[PDB]
Design a protein around this ligand. Structure first.
Ligand code: MG
Ligand code: MG
Ligand code: MG
Ligand code: MG
Ligand code: MG
Ligand code: MG
Ligand code: MG
Ligand code: MG
Ligand code: MG
Ligand code: MG
Ligand code: MG
Ligand code: MG
Ligand code: MG
Ligand code: MG
Ligand code: MG
Lengths: 184, 258, 134, 171
RNA sequence: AUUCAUAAUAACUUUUCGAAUCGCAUGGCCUUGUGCUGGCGAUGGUUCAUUCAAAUUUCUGCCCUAUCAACUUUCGAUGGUAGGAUAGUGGCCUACCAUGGUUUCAACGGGUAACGGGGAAUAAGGGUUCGAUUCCGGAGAGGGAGCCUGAGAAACGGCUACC
RNA sequence: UAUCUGGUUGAUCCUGCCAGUAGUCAUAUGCUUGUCUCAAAGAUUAAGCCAUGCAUGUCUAAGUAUAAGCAAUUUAUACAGUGAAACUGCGAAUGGCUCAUUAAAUCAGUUAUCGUUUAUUUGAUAGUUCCUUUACUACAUGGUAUAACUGUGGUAAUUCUAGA
């Protein structure tokens, strides 16, 4: 006797297991965005699928429907907020045709890469995972963070880490002690 | 089964208490009292969940056992004492007084009233009947029996209780054009100025109601609580005054200031 | 220490329990886990009542460190703090001592043994000894 | 033998089984309304008795070593007011407060008598309780009479208004 | 909507209830007597209302089967009159009386690896399958039956008998 | 994300099934298993059987205490401080578990009690009861037993009990 904890799955496997086209486009995305799995692509497809499920139900309704006005603006606001939806496309009809990798463009490692700071997309994932990137005054070590176009300018190194200062590091500290005993 | 129940699981308590489903297996089961179990605040939810004057159910017992809290002018040390609509809660500390009224969203809202407004209360009469020895009495919505009422008082009216003695000061008759307060149903917490009511001999009366913004709705008679003449009411209405703004208009107001 | 800058937010006065409730917000850059024993002293000085009327709890450190948010209470005097605070938190600060007690199973079995005896049981004690002779 | 007691005057010196209830010997209930089936041995004395309970009602001429030489005192004295009175038969006005049997106890060098109580004794506090309950019934009845009179006065006045109301009606 | 609430008359009862109870404070009045008054509570108590409930109850709605088509009424089936029982209505039971009631719009019988819903999985739309199990209602304490206490139990971490 | 593919023929177009394919708060099992949050869990077969130990007891200022209990109140010679035991009053009919029975039965929504019971809570609510009711009468208040307790005991044993 206690309220059950609600959970849900966040990915969808494709209907066909083996086709050349999908097995190429998905791997092109993973290589060009530095993703570990195909599950990280299925996740974006699943998330986009629910977006176009609600946008189709809204469009099939009448114009100036009180439900459509409230839900359509709210759906566009979220996509505009995270940068997936551009400011010039707010008609709720460009939502249905956005892209798959428009979401992947707004992930943390891509955007950490875009503002320099990685000089390779794979160097961004390890930098994030190793607790080096602070979105605000707070360390975020989740590679898929989906910055909301306001924390975009606040991406910076964590003050409590090397490359931000206040300590040389772990192997640097061990290395420095080696020459100290070598000098003497 | 085999006798009355005594435990109230969460996910089975009334939804207007706003109890988080986790952090506990049970919910406070209101004791027998003036008000129904389905519509009841009782103080443990009021003191802890509404006012944040306690952190646990143990601190609620500490507050009540020292005779700080009182309902209708009486101490009411019971931790799950059912407090319902129009009940007046007085705290000796903080010099605060309260009246239990429903928010426009259908929930009991924290309402602070003055000392003078805590010296009376309104009760919807439920039945006018002759007692023993031919003594008429009126039964209000909170179980209060008042002997020797005004002969003109009939059912569905609202009387004003002194709350120092159970005597009735003045009464509001149930007529068309009176300001009413919807208690129960999908339109819970709205104030709407009766226009007319349908007879429907057999049961389940219906009354047509339109608020200040000229939005009309129909509710059953037993959900209607007259609270005075149109315009000025007999109690201090909570913020919003029962308008029931749409969700589209509500967000713009929330977006007005930020 | 170093820029502790203790902040209390959402402060509310609670004379019903004769105390003040507030959310303790602690910033500890280049430092960790401000160690409530120190927290109580600085919190006591701010409200300048006493240390014995101040208690703190909660204080989950934020991810990445450098910050911690918890809860704190400041009573009017020792008498209020010694009558409303839980026993488990009073013994945390040394204002009370943890009473010695057997395990739960030990008390349960001892209670069940009493149930088997009607009355005080002195009479059966001498009767058992007398019957033990033969 | 086997310890089964002898019920008062039943039958049949052979041991039997009975359903035992409240206020019935050889059974102490552990619940409200509980009844149990236990074995009880008959009243008639037989050769299977491990022990007998005898009581002396008349004394002979030979002297018993431990029944007539030695005597034991009653453990407790009377507690109720009239039980104090019946103990001495003094009167209903002899202030039984000071006729209490006391028992000194010596834990150390200090002693005290610790006279128990006089229950059901007349006290000025009790007279106050009787006074308040008696007086309350007078005021409560009077209040209803006053309230009833006010209702009748209002009811008669409203009827008079209706009498003049219809007087204007029907020309 | 009432033979309702309520009141009145005539009686009846083997007779219910109408404070022989407890804590704290001790104050006023005199013809100062342990004189007379006098507060805040607790517990209990008759009737009504109220609340927590219970019992019965209206309408519609349930899976597979005809290699189940007729079923129910000996001794209860369907209904009436009267009574007993019950907290109450009622074939709930009894006496007398009538021959009634359900069924191809599927009664009745058999099966269920059937507790029923809120729900779960998969689905373009329509559906199919599942739901012992976090909530609601029901039933049971190895199988039966019977019963004391009590406001409430056919109670089993209560009793009684049989298996 | 409103999609199909392989298999009857020498080859063809069909009907048609078999096989493949994706999912499962559907189980089981195999190989393997570094981190944080969350989390079902003797239901299916056997509502089959159970050693053991727990799961129901309970007090205030305000029912009954001479503990032949503990200590000193010292305001106290009747008690008035804490408090074992026991009598009393409540609760034990809630909770927890399981799904065997059960197919207009349970149950869901919807109705009624103008057809009934209801401890508890909340709000009201007994001037009328000296019974030949002028000595019958205690109304500054009236009786009994018993537990706890002392001591004698019986049985191998039970939360067994008897006599005084
Ligand atoms: Mg149950
Ligand atoms: Mg409760
Ligand atoms: Mg009949
Ligand atoms: Mg009949
Ligand atoms: Mg079954
Ligand atoms: Mg259940
Ligand atoms: Mg049962
Ligand atoms: Mg079993
Ligand atoms: Mg049984
Ligand atoms: Mg058991
Ligand atoms: Mg062929
Ligand atoms: Mg071939
Ligand atoms: Mg297949
Ligand atoms: Mg099964
Ligand atoms: Mg009552």
């Amino acid at each position: 006797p206690r309220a059950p904890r609600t959970y849900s799955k966040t990915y969808s496997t494709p209907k066909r297991p083996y086709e050349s086209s999908r097995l190429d486009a998905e791997l092109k995305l993973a290589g060009e965005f530095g993703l570990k799995n195909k599950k990280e692509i299925y996740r974006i497809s699943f998330q986009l699928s629910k977006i176009r499920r609600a946008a189709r139900d809204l469009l099939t309704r009448d114009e100036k429907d009180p439900k459509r006005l409230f839900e359509g603006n709210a759906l566009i606001r979220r996509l505009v907020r995270v940068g997936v939806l551009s400011e010039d496309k707010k008609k709720l009809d460009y939502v249905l045709a956005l892209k798959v990798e428009d979401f992947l463009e707004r992930r943390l490692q891509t955007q950490v890469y875009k503002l320099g700071l990685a000089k390779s997309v794979h160097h961004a994932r390890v930098l994030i995972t190793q607790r080096h990137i602070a979105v605000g005054k707070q360390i975020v070590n989740i590679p898929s963070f989906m910055v909301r176009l306001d924390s975009e300018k606040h991406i910076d190194f964590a003050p409590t880490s090397p490359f931000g200062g206040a300590r040389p590091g772990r192997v640097a500290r061990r290395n420095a002690a080696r020459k100290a005993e070598a000098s003497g | 089964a085999r006798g009355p129940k005594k435990h109230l699981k969460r996910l089975a308590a009334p939804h207007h208490w706003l109890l988080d489903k986790l952090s506990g297996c049970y919910a406070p089961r209101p004791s027998a009292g003036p008000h129904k179990l389905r519509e009841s605040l009782p103080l443990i939810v009021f003191l802890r969940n509404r006012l944040k004057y306690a952190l646990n159910g143990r601190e609620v017992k500490a507050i009540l056992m020292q005779r700080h809290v009182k309902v209708d002018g009486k101490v009411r040390t019971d931790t799950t004492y059912p407090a319902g609509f129009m009940d007046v809660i007085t705290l000796d500390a903080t010099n605060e007084n309260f009246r239990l009224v429903y928010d426009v969203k259908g929930r009991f809202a924290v309402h602070r009233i003055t000392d003078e407004e805590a010296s009376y209360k309104l009760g919807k009469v439920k039945k006018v009947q002759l007692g023993k020895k031919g003594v008429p009495y009126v039964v209000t919505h909170d179980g209060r029996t008042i002997r020797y009422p005004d002969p003109n008082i009939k059912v569905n009216d609202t009387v004003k209780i002194d709350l120092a003695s159970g005597k009735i000061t003045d009464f509001i008759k149930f007529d068309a054009g009176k300001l009413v307060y919807v208690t129960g149903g999908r339109n819970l917490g709205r104030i709407g100025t009766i226009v007319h009511k349908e007879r429907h001999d057999g049961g389940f009366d219906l009354v047509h109601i339109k608020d200040s913004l000229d939005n009309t709705f129909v509710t059953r008679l037993n959900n209607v609580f007259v609270i005075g003449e149109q315009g000025k009411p007999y109690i201090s209405l909570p913020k919003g005054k029962g308008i029931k703004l749409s969700i589209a208009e509500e967000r713009d107001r929330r977006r007005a200031q930020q | 220490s170093d820029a502790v800058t203790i902040r209390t937010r959402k402060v509310i006065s609670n004379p019903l329990l004769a105390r003040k409730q507030f959310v303790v917000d602690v910033l500890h850059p280049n430092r960790a886990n401000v160690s409530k024993d120190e927290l109580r002293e600085k919190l006591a000085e701010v409200y300048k009542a006493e240390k014995d009327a101040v208690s703190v709890f909660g204080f989950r450190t934020q991810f990445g460190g450098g910050k911690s948010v918890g809860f704190g209470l400041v009573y009017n005097s020792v008498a209020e703090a010694k009558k409303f605070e839980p026993t488990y938190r009073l013994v945390r600060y040394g204002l009370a001592e943890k009473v010695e007690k057997a395990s739960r199973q030990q008390r349960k079995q001892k209670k069940n043994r009493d149930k088997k005896i009607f009355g005080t049981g002195k009479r059966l004690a001498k009767k058992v000894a007398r019957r033990n002779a033969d | 033998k086997q310890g089964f007691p002898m019920k008062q005057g039943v039958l049949l010196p052979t041991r039997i089984k009975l359903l035992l209830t409240k206020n019935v010997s050889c059974y102490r209930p552990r619940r409200d309304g509980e009844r149990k089936r236990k074995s009880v041995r008959g009243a008639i004395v037989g050769p299977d008795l491990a022990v007998l309970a005898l009581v002396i009602v008349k004394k002979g001429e030979q002297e018993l070593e431990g029944l007539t030489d030695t005597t034991v005192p009653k453990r407790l004295g009377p507690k109720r007011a009239n039980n104090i009175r019946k103990f001495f038969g003094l009167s209903k006005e002899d202030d039984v407060r000071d006729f209490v049997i006391r028992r000194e106890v010596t834990k150390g060098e200090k002693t005290y008598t610790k006279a128990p109580k006089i229950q059901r004794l007349v006290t000025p506090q009790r007279l106050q309780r009787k006074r308040h309950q008696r007086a309350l019934k007078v005021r409560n009845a009077q209040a209803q009479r006053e309230a009833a009179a006010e209702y009748a006065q209002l009811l008669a006045k409203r009827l008079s208004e209706r009498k003049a109301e219809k007087a204007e009606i029907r020309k």
